[PDB]
Amino acid sequence: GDVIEV
C-alpha cells in the first residue's frame, strides 16, 4: 500500500 504524510 501507500504511505501518505501531509
Q: Give the experimental resolution in Å.
A: 1.7
- The CA distance from 5 to 2, in Å, is 10
Computed on alpha carbons and rounded to an integer, the radius of gyration of the chain in Å comes to: 6
Q: Can you tell me whether residue 3 is helix, strand or coil?
A: coil
Q: Which three cell numbers stand for residue 3?
A: 504511505
Residues 6+ apart with CB under 8 A from 4: none
